[PDB]
Swiss-Prot record, chain C:
Subcellular location: Cytoplasm, Cytoskeleton; Cell projection, Lamellipodium; Cell projection, Ruffle; Cell projection, Dendrite
Function according to Swiss-Prot or TrEMBL: Contributes to the organization of the actin cytoskeleton and cell shape. Plays a role in the formation of lamellipodia and in cell migration. Plays a role in the regulation of neuron morphology, axon growth and formation of neuronal growth cones. Through its interaction with CTTNBP2, involved in the regulation of neuronal spine density. Plays a role in focal adhesion assembly and turnover. In complex with ABL1 and MYLK regulates cortical actin-based cytoskeletal rearrangement critical to sphingosine 1-phosphate (S1P)-mediated endothelial cell (EC) barrier enhancement.
PTM remark: Phosphorylated by PKN2 at both serine and threonine residues in a GTP-bound Rac1-dependent manner in hyaluronan-induced astrocytes and hence down-regulated CTTN ability to associates with filamentous actin. Phosphorylated on tyrosine residues in response to CHRM1 activation. Phosphorylated by PTK2/FAK1 in response to cell adhesion. Phosphorylated by FER. Tyrosine phosphorylation in transformed cells may contribute to cellular growth regulation and transformation. Phosphorylated in response to FGR activation. Phosphorylation by SRC promotes MYLK binding. Acetylated.
Domain comment (free text): The SH3 motif may mediate binding to the cytoskeleton.
UniProt name for this protein: Src substrate cortactin
Length: 59, 9, 60
């Protein structure tokens, strides 16, 4: 249900509507690794893209 | 400091 | 030069801290200081701070 999950390592502000924002320790669920640099997933009710290097995978 | 984000896809 | 090292923003960037600045594509960053390969310091639309070096293209 929560699929591949991760925890935010750093603060990140969505640059656009296709992106999501998060703070350190936030949880990103249902991650889609649509690229080595940009993943997609859900964080605090929002869905979009974020820097793969800004989170650490953790199930 | 944290690493910079990669340029957008 | 009053503007020093300048560059043009390639992509959108939203400051994720009070120590950072933000810009839209085509915005101009001036008085740049290349402090490291990741984050540079400069001015953009009245705001002083850090930003991703890879999000701009040097242009005098």
């Amino acid at each position: 249900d929560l699929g591949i999950t991760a925890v935010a390592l750093y603060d990140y502000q969505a640059a656009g509507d296709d992106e999501i924002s998060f703070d350190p320790d936030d949880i990103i669920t249902n991650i889609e690794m649509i690229d080595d640099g940009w993943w997609r997933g859900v964080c605090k009710g929002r869905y979009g893209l974020f820097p793969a290097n800004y989170v650490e995978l953790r199930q | 400091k944290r690493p910079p984000p990669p340029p957008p896809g």
